[PDB]
């Protein structure tokens, strides 16, 4: 976790080393109860001692809530008054053990400790490798979510005096010994106040600090980046709250009659951005309103304004990575699209609304059989279509979203496959006749569904709604499943694997898809960033030319994997963090020897140990079938599908090794070069080499216009 005794107050992660750990665990051996109770014992195991110490240090706040005291010469006891700083106190020496410990850093280790105990109290999976066998601390943009480059062409002492809005006098120098410590502390406080709710944790980096100096000089002498001090520049790192990232208002204190002290603080701090608004519900509050934009987020805009306002007029703020990524997301042909954020789903909701209207006009039509159900199952309906649904945009390959039409049960169906499908088409004909005769604003035509092998009669009704959308309708009965199992029975052993594969494809299109849609939508509304992450990942795959042989659902599940399994990392709240976590996971993944178990669950019904062991048995059985994995590369499974081969089947091992190779190339590039526009553009570049032949085709018409991008 990147923690040692290095000086945290100087603007880097730390302030907590193994010495500090040993001191505190000795203190827990000494005592530590709220009744001054001894907590651990001299004859425990390392596992017991470690669990107990983690439990205590995670549960007990030591900065704002309480403090811990003891005598080094006796019983330790926690006292429920905080000293606004991490305070373990020997009363024989009056020493705070954690004076090098920034409160923000304390919060960060508190979150890590909570994750540690959560992994430990998990009893099902192997948590050891997440606990100890990965260094999270290497990559900044993976460990944190939003880091911004902060340029300070400071200069010398008088340049500081005229450029730094903060005063540097004797009281600043006596409570913060060094200028750098003062600067980091001030920047921390100003960013914390100016952001507040929108974030989770903050960290500051003095890029360019060193600890080594010869015996030749009085001190460390630098000239780095305009300043002559022990940094090149500042980097701010943010762990950001997901659902608070796009709040167009920033509320302050309530408008009282006089000027309240906190409102005075807010208005002095904000000033030009301070305002009084009258809302809808009879409220009067101080706020600093913003504007939302696609390419750059509100955090970026506010962090520029606040730091420029309250630090220096020469400071510079950047994150070209996040701005580039947001530009790599496609943009709709909807009004005010650039102003529309990335966490706004209005196009999807418009689609769903016109579906509801259609749901009325079909569900109450007159029919042979009473309608049992209508089920959207579509990619857009689970918010994973790459291009957003634009009205009248029929250049989208996924324009016609899919909706099951299930009738009731009745045993007068034919028991023959072709006649069965032809009767289903007769149902769709009656629906189309009635819909045309009553609903003249709609339009309709029929099409041949050829996604399923060896099953040729399937016709689906495409209906066009005058909101500019298109739904394709297919029918489902129970005779489908019964007949397909009958066919696998009356197959011969030469043909049985082919009928099995066809049955799997039918299952994927007609039975698992509804559970797939239900689960992913219900979880995406909690994990807001999952939908942009998976759209970005789809863009990445389409750049790397793998979407032809990778279906949607494999991509979706491997995309949600880092969200549902953050540990040891965090839940991604920024597009760069999620995207790179997915690629990192692919690179680490060894599908020849790794299973994949997905618990599509809201944060903390989950999988029982029996189900986990059953899927693990299935995994071992398929590995015994083919340890080479030549006929089965990925084993991705969940409660909605323990068989797993349903989505992961039907792929070439060349395609899998190409994807693994591209993952490894991306990870090596990030390990080597660094995050900048050239590396991002190089990722989005294709290979176009390494083949046997390349054939390059140009359509008569450029379909961006009718695609609406």
């Amino acid at each position: 976790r990147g923690f040692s005794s290095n000086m945290s107050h100087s603007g880097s992660l730390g302030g907590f080393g193994t010495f500090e750990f040993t001191i505190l665990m000795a203190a827990l051996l000494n005592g530590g109860g709220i009744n001054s109770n001894k907590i651990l014992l001299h004859g425990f195991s390392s596992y017991q001692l470690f669990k107990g110490v983690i439990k205590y240090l995670a549960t007990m706040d030591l900065c704002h809530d309480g403090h811990l005291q003891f005598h080094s010469n006796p019983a330790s006891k926690y006292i429920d008054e905080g000293f606004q700083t991490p305070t373990l106190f020997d009363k024989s020496t009056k020493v705070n053990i954690l004076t090098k410990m920034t409160v923000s850093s304390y919060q960060i280790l508190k979150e890590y400790a909570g994750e540690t105990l959560r992994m430990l109290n998990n009893v099902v999976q192997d948590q050891f490798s997440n606990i100890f066998l990965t260094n999270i601390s290497r990559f900044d943009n993976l460990k944190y979510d939003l880091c911004y480059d902060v340029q300070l062409p400071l200069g010398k002492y008088n340049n500081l005096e005229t450029s730094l809005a903060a005063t540097f006098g004797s009281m600043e120098r006596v409570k913060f010994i060094t200028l750098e410590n003062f600067l980091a502390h001030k920047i921390t406080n100003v960013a914390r106040y100016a952001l507040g709710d929108r974030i989770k944790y903050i960290q500051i980096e003095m890029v360019g600090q060193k600890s080594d100096f010869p015996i030749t000089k009085r001190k460390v002498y630098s000239n780095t980046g305009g300043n002559h001090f022990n940094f090149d520049f500042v980097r701010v790192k943010l762990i950001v709250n997901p659902s608070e990232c796009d709040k167009l208002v920033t509320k302050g204190p309530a408008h009282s009659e006089t000027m309240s002290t906190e409102a005075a603080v807010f208005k002095n701090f904000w000033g030009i951005k301070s305002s009084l608004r009258r809302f809808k519900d009879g409220s009067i509050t101080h706020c600093c309103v913003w504007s939302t934009s696609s390419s750059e987020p509100i955090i970026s805009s506010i962090v520029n304004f606040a730091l420029q306002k309250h630090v220096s007029k020469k400071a510079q703020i950047s994150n070209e990575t996040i701005k580039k990524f947001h530009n790599f997301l496609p943009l709709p042909n909807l009004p005010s699209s650039a102003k529309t954020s990335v966490l706004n789903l209005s196009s999807f909701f418009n689609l769903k609304k016109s579906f509801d209207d259609l749901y009325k006009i079909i569900f109450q039509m007159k029919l042979p059989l009473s309608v049992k159900s209508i089920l959207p199952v579509g990619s857009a309906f689970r918010y994973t279509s790459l291009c957003q649904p634009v009205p009248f945009a029929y250049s989208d390959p996924d324009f016609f979203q899919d909706v099951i039409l299930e009738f009731e049960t009745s045993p007068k169906w034919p028991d023959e496959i072709t006649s069965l499908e032809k009767a289903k088409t007769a149902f769709l004909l009656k629906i189309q006749e009635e819909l045309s005769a009553n609903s003249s604003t709609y339009r309709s035509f029929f099409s041949r569904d050829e996604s399923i092998p060896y099953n040729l009669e399937i016709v689906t009704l495409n209906i066009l709604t005058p909101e500019g959308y298109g739904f394709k309708f297919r029918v489902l009965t129970e005779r489908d499943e019964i007949l397909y199992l009958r066919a696998i029975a009356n197959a011969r052993n030469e043909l049985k694997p082919e009928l099995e594969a066809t049955f799997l494809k039918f299952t994927a299109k007609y039975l698992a898809s509804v559970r797939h849609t239900r689960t992913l939508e219900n979880i995406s509304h909690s994990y807001q960033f999952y939908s942009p992450v998976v759209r970005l990942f789809k863009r990445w795959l389409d750049t790397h030319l793998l979407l032809g042989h990778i279906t949607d659902e494999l991509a979706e599940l491997i995309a949600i994997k880092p969200f549902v399994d953050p540990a040891p990392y965090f839940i991604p709240g920024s597009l760069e963090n999620g995207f790179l976590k997915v690629l990192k996971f692919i690179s680490q993944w060894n599908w020849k020897d790794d299973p994949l178990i997905l618990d599509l669950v809201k944060p903390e019904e989950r999988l029982t140990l029996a189900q986990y062991k059953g899927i693990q048995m299935n995994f071992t059985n398929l590995r015994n079938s083919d340890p080479n994995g030549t006929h089965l590369q990925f084993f991705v499974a969940s409660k909605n599908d323990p068989s797993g081969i349903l989505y992961s089947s039907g792929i070439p091992l060349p395609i899998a090794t190409r994807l693994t190779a591209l993952a490894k190339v991306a990870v090596n590039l990030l390990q080597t070069h660094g995050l900048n526009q050239q590396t991002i553009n190089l990722l989005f570049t294709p290979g176009l080499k390494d083949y046997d032949f390349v054939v390059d085709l140009r359509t008569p018409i450029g379909l961006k216009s009718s695609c609406g991008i």
Partner: peptide, 26 residues
């Protein structure tokens, strides 16, 4: 958790364990 955990930490401590010859050299 206990049994596999002891096995895993045993493997870890064995992998990271230091050399007595180097210790006495220092």
């Amino acid at each position: 958790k206990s049994n596999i955990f002891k096995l895993q930490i045993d493997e870890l401590l064995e992998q990271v364990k230091l050399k007595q010859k180097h210790v006495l050299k220092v």
